[PDB]
């Protein structure tokens, strides 16, 4: 994946990210924008409206977990495969989440980063991050591939 250069750029920027905040936002927007994904979180309660979703405590919390998993892979950018083995098993083997959804979440995260950092989130920076979500998505769908 990422060169050392790109690795550093991404790594440096990640440090400005508030996982609590961005995590809940990315998960909430995924359920809102691609409503079929709600079927997997039925348990989380009220997801009836955009507002219900975005204010859902379970959504905010789960969102946190997701970004944390993102933080980790950032730390293991060379072996996403192994970093995500256990998650690939939960998602594919147990949940049977279609791998295209993994890509949808990655893209939503990028939209959320753009919204929160504005001009700081440059085209080049975005490009780096796209490589990353791509790597994350691939590593998770491995139980399929």
């Amino acid at each position: 994946m990422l060169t050392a250069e790109e690795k550093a750029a991404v790594t440096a920027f990640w440090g400005k990210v508030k996982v609590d905040e961005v995590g809940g936002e990315a998960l909430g927007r995924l359920l809102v924008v691609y409503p079929w994904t709600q079927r997997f979180f039925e348990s989380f309660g009220d997801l009836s409206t955009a507002d219900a979703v975005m204010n859902n405590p379970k959504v905010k919390a789960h969102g946190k977990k997701v970004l944390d998993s993102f933080s980790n892979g950032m730390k293991h950018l060379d072996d996403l495969k192994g970093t995500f083995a256990a998650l690939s098993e939960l998602h594919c083997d147990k949940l049977h989440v279609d791998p295209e959804n993994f890509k949808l979440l990655g893209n939503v995260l990028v939209v959320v980063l753009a919204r929160n950092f504005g001009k700081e989130f440059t085209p080049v920076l975005q490009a780096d991050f796209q490589k990353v979500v791509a790597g994350v998505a691939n590593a998770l769908a491995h139980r399929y591939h």
């Binding site: 809102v32 955009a50 979703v53 939209v111 919204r115 001009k119 085209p123 975005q126």
Partner: protein, 141 residues
């Protein structure tokens, strides 16, 4: 196939863009080219470098088309017919590319309209762009 709520959200959002449509059109292309290099294959003879007057110009063309679409949310087919002919029949652009440009455009808007780019607005703009893409990929004939 946009609900009234969707149309109101798009109209509202595009209104905030106002006079920056062209600049946003250009940045969206740039983000696309950078993030998804393969798309560069459709512009063989375009300097796709940062600041190229060709990206600039092109960004302004796309923005114009989108404005046209926004003003004709009731008849996109009719609004984008010439472009379907161009993109699908003439250029034979693989349909996956429409999704890359749509994403790039959402990234651009989000970056420039943080307070306006609410989850509901994002949902509506995502649907609008998909509808626009559906029309541009309609005449594969």
């Amino acid at each position: 196939v946009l609900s009234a709520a969707d149309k109101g959200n798009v109209k509202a959002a595009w209104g905030k863009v106002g006079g920056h449509a062209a600049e946003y059109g250009a940045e969206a292309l740039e983000r696309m080219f950078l993030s998804f290099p393969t798309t560069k294959t459709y512009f063989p003879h375009f300097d796709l470098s940062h600041g190229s007057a060709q990206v600039k110009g092109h960004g302004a063309k796309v923005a114009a088309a989108l404005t046209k679409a926004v003003e004709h949310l009731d008849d996109l087919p009719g609004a984008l017919s010439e472009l379907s002919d161009l993109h699908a029949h003439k250029l034979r652009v693989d349909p996956v590319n429409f999704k890359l440009l749509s994403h790039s455009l959402l990234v651009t808007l989000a970056s420039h309209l943080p307070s306006d780019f609410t989850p509901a607005v994002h949902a509506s703009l995502d649907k609008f762009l998909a509808n626009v893409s559906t029309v541009l990929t309609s005449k594969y004939r």
